Every structure is written in C-alpha cells, then in structure tokens.
C-alpha cells in the first residue's frame, strides 16, 4: 500500500475514495480558481465541469466550500485563500475549517502554502495546526506548497520546490502538491526528498495538448502519485476527453500516443 | 426557486422573509450608511425612513445593531465597520456577531468586504470564518463585495467586480451585493461568473429618476436578483414613491415609464 | 422617558441610577484622568474630590477599577486605557472587563474610541464587541466618542462631531460622551443624528466659570442629556459649588446668573 | 400591545409571527402528538395536515424537530418528550434544544411540564433553564403547564389548573397552555392569576362540533389569549374548515353558530 | 455599615445597600415567590399592585422569581429555588434560576431556600454552597431560607433545628439568612447568637390579630433579628400598605406594637 | 428520492454509501451482538463474517467502535450499549459518541431504544440529543425502536412498533429499524406512519430460509427502505449466499422460490 | 506482532514497555488491592512488594495514583474504585482520569467493570467513554471484565466470562484481564471470542504453589496474552522467586515442573 505508514483509520478510509485501489495513483481536478482570479475560463458554469471531469474519470474534485455549497467523486474542501486583486497576491490566510469541511461529507482538505511570500511564517503555523486537527478528525490533508515571493525568480527551482515539497511533509501534511521542476531527475529528487506522496499541479494551459500530456508522463515517471490539474483540464476544448487522457497516463501509464487518441 | 440549492432549513425559512415569493426577486433597502458617512441626509430620522421604504414596499431594510435597539419588513443586522473619518477608510473590521443578530431576531446578515485594500486578506478570513457561523445558525449571509484599494481606479471594471462577487459565493455567501458594472452585458457577465444570486447596490443618487430607475431595470435585464440601494431611496424628495418605483421594476418586471408614474 | 427604546430591563435598572428621575438627564463626573496624564490637580486626593463632588449633587463618577477597589451617588467603570507617555497618546486599548465592572457593583461601563486615530478599527471592533457585552449583561454602556488623529485639526468639527457620535450609537452605546462643537445650531445636528442620548464633555479648565457655564447651558438647549465634565469640576477652587451650579443648569433649566451663585466667593 | 411588558426584541419580532395583528390572539395547532401516543388520527400525512390547518387560517404549527426536518404558517418547536408506553407516561425530558430550533428557523419553543408527576421538580429545573435560554437567543417559550400525576383525580381541577398556569409564568414561559377548567368562571381564575397570556388546549376529541366549540368560545370570554388545539381539528372530517371555525371565534369573536358555518 | 464591616465584598456592599437602611442597618424584605409554591393565592394574584403598594408603604426591597419581574424604587432580590406543594414531594426544591441571569435583571441579590430535613436535602446543601461561590465571584449578596423540614420533624419551630438551619447557611456561604421565630425571644436568640450571619425572620402564615403578628416581629428585632422577610402577613392584610408601615415602624424605629398600630387603618 | 427532504449535504453524501442508488433500498448486516450477547454463533470470527457478507452484496455493516480499532461497504457505528448479564438487560446507555465515529471514517451512527423499558425516558433523550449532534455533523443517524419493558407482552405489536418508530423519526432519527409486525398490512401502517423510512431487523434465527426470506419479502411489499439483519445471515451455513439472496429480494425485488436459488 | 492491528503510534509505543518483546506476552502484577480491601497481606510496604515484584522481572506494576505518588517496570495507573466496606461492595466509580495518568507517565489505565452488577450500564458507559479519551491520547486501556452480581453464581461461569470479555473489546480496551474460566478448554473459547488479548487473574491465594502455576500454564495453553496476578504473587513467602517462576511459564513456556524450580 502507498499508505502502509498512516496508522489514522479515519484518513486510509477517506484517502481511498480519492486514490485509484489497482494503480495506487490519483487524479485530483482543483477548481478552486475562482478565489484566486474570479470566473475564469472553464469555471464559469462550474456544475458542468465538475461533472465532465467526474465522467472523464477523476478521482476528486477539489473546491471551496461556497461552490460544494451549489454544485460521483471524492470531494476535497480548500481551506486557504487570497486573490491576485489583493495588495499582497500572494497572501494565503485560512478563510474554511476543518471541520466545516468534515460535517460537508468531504473526504480530505487542503490548504496552500506560498513559501518565501510576506509573513509566510503564518501559514507555516496554520499548516501545522490544520496538519493536527486533521490528524484527530482522520481527514487526510492535502498541501499545496509552493516557493514564490520577492526573492524567487524562479518557482520551479528543483531545491525551492523540494524544500517547499519537504516542509509539508515535515508539517503533517498527507499529500503534497507542488510544481513541477521542468526535467525528470530534478522532480525525482522533490520526490525523493518528499517523506509524503507528491502530486504535480497543471500549470497555466499549455499550448499543445502533447506538451501537457508530456509534462504529466514525465513527473509519473520521476514519481509522482498523481496529478493535480486544473486549468489544463476545465480550460480545455474536450474537458471529457483530456481528462480521459491524463487518466490513461496516470493509472494505466499508457504513453502519450495512445493518450491523445482520448481526445475528441 | 432561486435557492433551490441551499440545503439549509433555516436559511430558507429566512430567505422567505426578504425575498418576493411570486417574483422571487428582492428590494433591500441597505441604511448602514451612518457609521461609513455619519448622519447623512434621508437617515437622520432613521425610523420615519424605515416606515416609509417599508410601505414603498420594500422588503427588508439592513441596519447596525445600534439602529435597529432603537427604530412590516425583514430585517437585516450588518456585521462590518469602517469609517470614512479613519487614516483607512477602506478597513473593514466586524463589530456585530451572527449570534447577536440572530437574538434580535433579524432575518439575515450582511458583511463588506472591500477586495483590493490594505490587508483585504483579513476580511477573506471574515467572510470565510462568518459564513460557517451562519451556516451553522441557518442565517442566510448577504456579502457586498467591492473591488476597492490603492491600485484600483476603477471600482466598476467588469472582470474586477465578477471577480469580487464570485469570491462571495466560493467563500460562503448566500447573496451578494455589488455595484452595477454600466452595461446589461459585462454584469450578466458578474451574474454568470457567481454561483449566488446577485444584487445591485444603487450608488450615489443620480441626477435624474430616469438615470436610476433605468440602470436598476438594467441590472434585472442582466440577470440580477433584485437591488439593495440605498442613498438613491432614502435621500430623494419621495421616498415611499420612489420605493414603489423601484418595487414595481424589481417584482413586476415595469419598463420605465410605467414605474416613474409611481413617484410624486 | 428617555430610554422608552430600551428593551433591557438590566439597562432602564442601572440607568436610574445615573440619571435624575425628575430631569431625565444626568451629570457624571468622569475622573479617569489619571491614566491618561498621571496625577493631576484635582485628582491627588480621590476620595475626596469623589465625596466632594458627590456632596454637590453628582449623579455619579467614572473611575478605573484600581481607583474604586480604593477610595448615594452612580458608578461607572471606564474599560478604556492610554497615555500621553506612550509614543501613541490616541491609542485606546480594554484594559478593564464589563464582568469585572460587575462584580464590582458598578451601574454602568464606558469606552472611549479616538475616531481618526492610528488602527482606530481596532476600538471600533471593540466597541462593537464590547457594546453586546454590556447587551448580555444588562449593563449600560457610555461611549466617548471624538474625533481625533493625524489628520484632524479640529476636535470639535461639527460633521467629525457628529460622525462620531452616530458611530457610538451605530455600534450599540446606550449613551454618548463628546466634545461640544462651539455652538448651540451645529451641535444640535450631534443631537439629532445621534440616536442615542448625548452628554458633553466639560474641556480643558476655562478661565471663567461664566464661560464654563455658559457653554453647558448652550449645550442643554441643543439638546444634551447632561454632562460628563472632570477637569472644569474637580480643577475647581470650590468642587462643590461648582458641581452645585452644573447640577442647577441640567437639572433645574436654571439661568448662568442664578447658577453662578452657587460657587464660593 | 398584549407584550408591552416583554423587554425582548428578539421575543417581540417572533412572537408576531404567530399572533394575529389585530387580535392579538393566537391560534395554534400543536401536532406533537406523535412522541406521545404514536401515529394517531390526522396525524399520519402530517404534511397534508399542516397544509390544511395553514390553510384554515391557524397562526402556528408546533411540532418535534424530526417532523419539521422532513414535511404559510409560524413554527413552534416542542422541546419535551415522553410516550404512554413508557412506565412512567407522565415524564417528560428535555429532547431539543433551542439553539437547535432556532437554527431551524423556529418562532417558538415549546416545554409541556406535568406538575404533579413523579420527579416532576426535575421538570421545573428544565423549564426555569430553557426559560434563561429563551431569553438569551430572544426565543419566546410556550409552557404547556398541567396538573397530571398519582394524586391528582381531576386534572381539570380549576385550582390546580391555576397553580399549574401560575408557576410557568413564575419560572419565565412567555405563553401559557392548560387545560380549560370546565366553566367560564373558574378559567377566568386560571387566566387572572397567570401573568403570562394563557391558551386553552383542545384536549380529547369531542363528540359534537359546539360542544368544542362552545368550550373555545368560552375559554375566550374567560380572558384566554388564544387556543392550541390539536386532536379536535386535525381529527376532525373537515380540517380545513373546523379550523376556520375557530379562527372566526378567535380572531372575530363570531359566534358558535356562525362559526359552525365554516364546517363542511 | 456595622452589619456587613466583615464582608471582604465590593460588590456585595453595594449592592447590600440597597436592601438595608442606611441608619436602623435593619431590612424589611416582602418576599412574594409563593406563587410557584402554593399558585397564585390571596394578595399575589395583582402581583403589580401588591408590589408597588408594599414599595408605597416603604419595604426595603421585594423577592421574586424571574418570570414575575419579567412582567412590568425598592432592592429586587430573584429567587432561585423552586418546589410546589402539589408536587408528589412538596419539600423537594431545585434551582430554577441562575445568578448569572439575575445579575443580568439587575437584581440586587439572590436567594435560596434549603429545607434541612427533606428528602435528598443534601442536594441542595451542594446547591447552596455552589450558588454561594457564584455568588462571592460576581459580588451578588445571598440570602439563604433555611428551614429544619421533613419526614421527622414534628416541630418546624424546633430551637435546636432552626439554629441548626440557619448555621449551616451561614456555614455554606450565605451573607443573610431567612427563617422561622422559635416562638420566644430567649431560644430565638440563640438561633441569633449561632448564626455568624444577620438573621431575618420569616413571617409564617396569616395571624388572627395584627397584634400576634406585630408582637411577634417586635420580639424577634428583640431577640437580634437583622431586619424581616414576612409575605403573607403583608400582602394578604386588608391595608397592605399601612402593615408594612407598621413593620418599617417596629424594625427600621424600634417604635412599639402600640405606635406600630396607628399605621394599619381601618 | 428518499432522502429528497434532507437538507443536509453531509448525509446526502454519507447515505449514499449504505444504499442502492438503483432501488434506493439498503441492506444492513448489524453486528452489535457481541456486546448484548457475547461471542455468539457467527460473530467469533468477526474478520470472517464481515467479508463474508460484504461479498454477499450487503451495503454496510454495522458495528462498536471495538471491533472497527481490529477488522469493501459502509461502515456503522452503534453508539448504545446494554448487556443480557445486566440486572436490567433493557437498559441502554451510550457508549460512543457521533465525534468517534466520524474520525473513524464511519458513515453513519447507530442508537437503540428500548421504548418501554426502566427509565427509557433518559434514552428518549439520549437519542433527541444525539440527533441533533449528527445533524451538525452530517452524520446519517439510524434509530433501532423497540417496543420492550415490564408491560409489553408482544413487542411485535402493530401499535407499539408504529409508535415506537414515530417516535424516532420525531426526535430527529433519518432511518429507524424495528420488527416486523407479523404481516404486510399492519407493517404498511408501520410504515405509514413513520416519516422517516424503516429497515426490518432480522429476529432469531428462523427454523427455514422461506420463513426468513419471505418475512422480508413480506416486509418490503409492506413499504419497508430495506433491511438490517444480523443473526439470520451470520448464523447461517452459507453467509455469503444468504446475503445474496436478501439482496435479490431487496435489490432486485426477486421472489422467494427465486431468491432461495442463492443459497449454496 | 500482537498490535499488528492497533492503528495508533501512542498505543504501540507506550504497550511495548508492558509486553516482552521477544515473547510478546505479559506479566502484570495488579496492586491496587488497597482501595478494595485495606492494607492487607503483601500491600503494606508497597514499596517493597513493587521493588520484589520488579526484580522477580515483572513487566508492570497496577497501582492507583495515590501509591505512585510515593512509589525499572512499566506503570498502569487504575482508574476504578470501590470498597468491600461499601454498602454495595460490587460498585466501581471513576476515580482517577486518564489525563492524570499521563502527566504522571503511565505506560497504561486500567477500569474494572463489574458485568451484572447494580446499575452496571454505568459502568459500560464509563468504559467507552474512557476508551476514547484512551484512544485520543495514544494510552493502551486495560479492561478488567468480571461477571458480578446478584443473580451470578459462578463468577467462573465460561458463558459469562466470555461474554464479559467480549464487552470489553467491543467497547473499546486494548487489553483484557478476566478470571480463568477452570479448564483449558472453556477459557479457549473466552480467548477466542474476544477480539482483543485476555490476561488471567491470579484469584485468591492457592493453598499450594502447583495449584497457581498450573492454572497460569493452563491459561497460556487456552491461549492468554499474559497474566495480571496480585495475591498470589504479593501474598507469597518468596515474592521474587514466585515471580521469576510466573515469567518462566508464561514468557518462555516453561513447565511447572521447570517452573517451581524457581521458588526457594
């Protein structure tokens, strides 16, 4: 099991509702955008979207609890937020708890950590905090850690994103999101380093459906335990389809030839 | 029904007291205006207006708990402060709680928060941490979201206010207030991007009854759920006339000219 | 009635006892002064000034808790501290409790929020909080309101004036304390948008008794509910004469001439 | 105002939710029945009953938050519960709170206290507490009051009925409920020395309509500030029009014999 | 004031004195919470009037439960026990009202009512010394009703009970205590003399003559008595407000029965 | 729908995973026992059973927090507790609270009532106020209500077993179990008048499967959501089959002489 | 591993300072006789018995706070009492709280439940509730599960036992000490139906050292997880050797023969 180490029944429950049982791997779609940058493209009719992604065959879907709150698969509550319209874009404050999430029916929350931005020391408590009251409730955390602030030009440095990967680990976070580092061995060593399963994030739309898809078998490759799409997928022409796409890579490790014929 | 989606008994119950049953619209009448501006004209005698705007019909005033211990419509308790007079005259910070409203048997909660100004994350976290509260006590929460701050000229830029009211409904709020963005199509476009019913604030009053009662029939052509104006109401030479004005275009779907015939 | 909106019965209880059933309106005698600029003339020998005061027909006293738990008439305990040793003189922090100002049998509680000062959203909150407190526990609260802060000249602007007193009663003040604005037509406009009774502040000692009284006497045709004046009192050769002939002016409608007479010669 | 006295802004708000503005009576119809003697008549499609008795005119439905939670009028949650089949008939234990109910959106809460019973003083502690509560989330409180226990042979007896009434006023209930005494004179006993209003129950279904009808119009003329019946109108062939019998005597002070015009 | 120079309480002196005079630091309390007792009997049935008349003839202050303060310038003392005769043990008493809430009516004290003697009495002997903590912490002045009642006490009156009673309010943390006269001066003053605490003495039920009750309360001030706690005696007179004239005269004067007389018309 | 009246996202979601969406019937195998009646026929080897009737298509098993801590459905946790060695064997006092089984992973909790029985009162509140922590929670609660006690000859009486689950779903329960009444028409008025739906629960082992298996028919032909049996396909010589064959009669609302096939 | 199923780090960690490792059995040695009986036969110079008791080799010692805060073995601190003095001898209260237990570093808290006596569904409650807050704090809980009462005549009854035992593991406890049933066979069947490991009491003191050591030999043989024996050890003449000759039996499986070897 991937989970052989988390001796808390409460999050192995929860956890397999968000992991494929055969391939031990999981595709979450986060679309928890809209606190971040309004409607954007692809979450404007977000019952639509998430239901696409649902029939493509994503695992989980993860949003705010003010869009559950509206509109079969694992749900996981954001817990974290701050706009790009904020003085301070990269501010991240706990705006949902845990427990909110938990009387929701939710199966995991997650919570987003910009290391190296203003003050980030905050969101180093509330990690730890949440990480414990996660603990006690059995709901598996997922934490989204990031290196970016003033002083980083790059936030795909393998060593900012492996240092990032880790404090989440460290913290108590059960699953870590992150970035990833542009080549297979700087991202094995994010995971190597990673004491939790790492998951990559989608990034911006990409202009060629082969270069995401690429992008995806490579993190895979240097051992990831999954993905964590958003834009590349709701942002798409066929949301079904490159769902379907990154679902062959991700539990069936079918190559990009084979991926791409999923979309229409 | 508007709300067939809030799995919320006592919301609902609520949401029946300031929302037309037939319409399924709603006239607020927000008069919180005297801790932003002080004693302003049309709310220095505060209760004379509350009767007034209640015949005009309209279907529940918004007031601070300090009004209301004081002065047949719904009745809806503000929870945030600031003042014009303050070195920030943007903060917002809360000085009423849900439970407070909630013993004075007020129908609804309102809260502002002003995306784009100093330390605008502070009221994410209130408006995240308030809307569990009120989900809690089945206390429908109005959120008027403004794009306001130092890097903000214009406070009516379409993609700034969809995206202000979007952060609304993803954070929590049942309803959302905002400004009219100046055209029936980038506001449909705010209507759209928010998962909530959205209501349009009346700004500060117009020149003409035209001007006014136009820019409301507008907003309802966008897609809004009714109006929560204030200055435009209160301070003009007939109040319950042009309360009926603004009924008979919200409720009744009047045109214009059919609606200024009801002011004196 | 004056309080006939009230409908908390430990509120009408304790207001009585700070206001004259007959005049409806009331004199407190604030003396919190201490806290803000140390021991100052008037205010070295508490107790007395306290009993003086009191003699002469105060309808109570505002005080910290520390100078009550040391050494009839009407007690308020004020929840609000600062000082003008501090390198922020307008800051206002709660440095007292309203269960504490219960426990101790006062009749009423005040706060005091510097509207224009550094983080003055702070106090608002505070108010705000505060004001339910005193909602749950049936204890009346008096907030000083003023305008004050780095980018107000004039304390005593008729607009900032009446801004800040509608704040106070906005955010739950059962009474408000502030600054007069100079004249009897701009502070009627305080009274009037002010939902909550309104008590002025007495101001720094005056050099005449003449002028003092005059101004409170204008005050009560604007439509004050009293005062709550310390320094022009307690600063005063004779305490007692004076709080006499302030008493004579709220609740006797008296005249400046025939309340004058009330001071030693 | 018949609450002149009550200093409670919350209790005033609610309180004219479930009494008539012109009346100034009230007219009730409680449905708890179901914890108490199972699913008896009328009370099996509770959903259609309370449609009828709404419809019929009746100011409240009052009912046990599980009912509620399932299927225009005001809402009284009971808070008491006990069965006929448990050994000991007459006890009744707190099984909802008020916080519960008012999250609910509840105008009212009701205790039913039987003054007489064994351990009955545990049931003046309950009432004198929820009393407190009542008080603090501005909840008026309905204290269905009777002298029911191993020594009392008639429950009905106008002295006991009185004391009954009086202690629930003593302990803080805004209404009171008890049985009618039997004759004008002696409720009018009952009434003078409660100071809270009193409401007359229906009690077991009679055999002629006047017969009941008689008793509610007599109760009226007693002082009685309303009625709470339930087995005599929802047990009755004409719902609807039985209720609109009372009503007529309530709120018209009609006669027996033009309200019996209003039964089908 | 003398009574109380022991009592290390800010807020218990406060608002202790607005339930005693000043001069006599004697008290005359008119307690009205037998409604809940015995229903709404003879004189607290237009509880308004018989509060303001019993005000009008000069009472230090009133007792009530909260519901009846609830409903429309004395001491206001709520009462926090409850108990009802047509309850299948009329002794049992439980706490109906907090202290909290009392506070928040403005009451100027709160009292309790312990019959020593009932079934499970040791209950309230644990709601007695409980309340009395809450008490001291929010600075409300408590008065205890201590009475030697049950299953094996012929004589309620009893003066070895009743000193024993009211001791053990006084023991338990009560800053005043209600109870029965021992029916003579000497025995009563030992329930005085035991009792660390001011001592005020009940009324009992409705007398004959004004002159058995009058004597009666003259002989209690006589026995050291800190003042009078009588209900029924004053409301259930004809002349409710001169009684309580001729109470105010016999306590807060130390005038005479005779003089205490002239008050009552009629 | 079934559960189309709850407004509760969190038992929506929660209730999905212990019934059929298909026939929107479900299967419960309760195995509690251990704590009633100690290690009795079939519950030994609890690993063994609950896989056993997981294979056999059962929704969920329901179990004390115990044996959860030791060894693919839903999982229910019970939260009463009372044994056959106790001087009163009808007494039941909570043993876990909704807080543990929720941490647990748990779907839904479970609570027993001895309507009847010494002092139930105490259990009638113990459910009310259960009921409203699983309504904060999201938590599905279900109620078994038993007639049983000193004066109750049958306990499979129809007025007894129709009031005893009124009762439960009064005070807030979202499912009740009880005993089936004996035959279809006066089950039907069980059913009837409980608005919350009713599971039957098993009985002791019968002497045929047609007895059992037609019991259940009988019992779903009656209007019953489904059926939580324990001992007749624990103690059964092929679990597995057993519990295939319910589920036929259940799910696919088969036959006797059809469902009897399963059993191997 | 005999944990291999105890999901929870605190457990594991702190029952491996109660167990020996290489034989992953236990000997306890219970001293908490003093509350129950006074000062009697061993317990009078705890000091000494606890200190003879360790050097015997005993893996931990069961005391009541009191004594430890007097006086290398692990630590279990007892959480019931009750008196043989006391009118109803049979009663156990909570007496200590497992908080104290862990600020005073107890590898362990133990309860006594005594099944089938008065009012023992007190009991049951207390064992649940204290086995969650066990559960929260990482403490292994040991469930003393005796059938006692008015109608039990054999105490030793294999039914009862059994049953009393399985109440234990199902209500929560980690580990379970019950009295050996008489014969190997029966006391199998109490091993095997309850779901958690069973230690053997001691009893009262046997005549004979072979009469003790062969029923501890016979327990092991049944399948005990250790014993928890007080009386024959403490009350013996040779407390250490008595000890070292326990340890023989029950962690190397040695022979009574080889056993008694020990005793000098």
Redesign the interface.
């Known amino acids: 099991e991937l989970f052989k180490d988390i001796?808390?029944?409460?999050?192995?429950?929860?956890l397999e509702r968000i992991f494929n049982r055969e391939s031990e791997k999981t595709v979450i779609v986060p679309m928890?955008h809209?606190?971040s940058?309004?409607?954007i493209k692809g979450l404007?009719d977000?019952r639509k979207t998430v239901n696409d992604v649902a029939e493509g065959g994503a695992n989980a879907v993860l949003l705010?609890?003010?869009?559950?709150?509206?509109?079969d698969v694992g749900?996981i509550i954001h817990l974290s937020?701050?706009?790009?319209?904020?003085?301070?874009p990269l501010?991240?404050?706990?705006?949902?708890?845990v427990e909110?999430a938990?009387?929701?029916?939710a199966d995991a929350v997650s919570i987003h950590v910009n290391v190296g931005s203003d003050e980030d020391w905050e969101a180093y408590r509330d990690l730890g905090m949440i990480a414990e009251t996660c603990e006690?409730?059995?709901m598996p955390l997922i934490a989204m850690m990031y290196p970016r602030g003033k002083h980083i030009q790059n936030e795909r440095d393998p060593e900012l994103v492996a240092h990032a990967a880790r404090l989440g680990a460290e913290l108590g976070a059960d699953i870590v999101k992150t970035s990833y580092t542009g080549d297979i061995d700087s991202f094995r060593d994010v995971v190597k380093g990673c004491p939790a399963p790492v998951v990559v994030a989608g990034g911006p739309k990409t202009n060629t459906d082969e270069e995401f898809l690429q992008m995806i078998k490579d993190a895979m490759e240097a051992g990831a335990a999954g993905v964590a799409v958003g834009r590349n997928i709701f942002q798409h022409d066929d949301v079904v389809g490159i769902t379907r796409a990154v679902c062959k890579i991700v539990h069936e490790n079918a190559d990009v030839e084979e991926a791409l014929k999923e979309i229409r």
């Open positions: 001796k808390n029944l409460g999050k192995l429950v929860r928890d809209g606190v940058n309004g409607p404007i977000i705010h609890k003010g869009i559950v709150r509206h509109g749900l937020g701050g706009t790009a319209i904020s003085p301070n501010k991240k404050v706990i705006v949902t708890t909110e938990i009387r929701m029916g006690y409730w059995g």
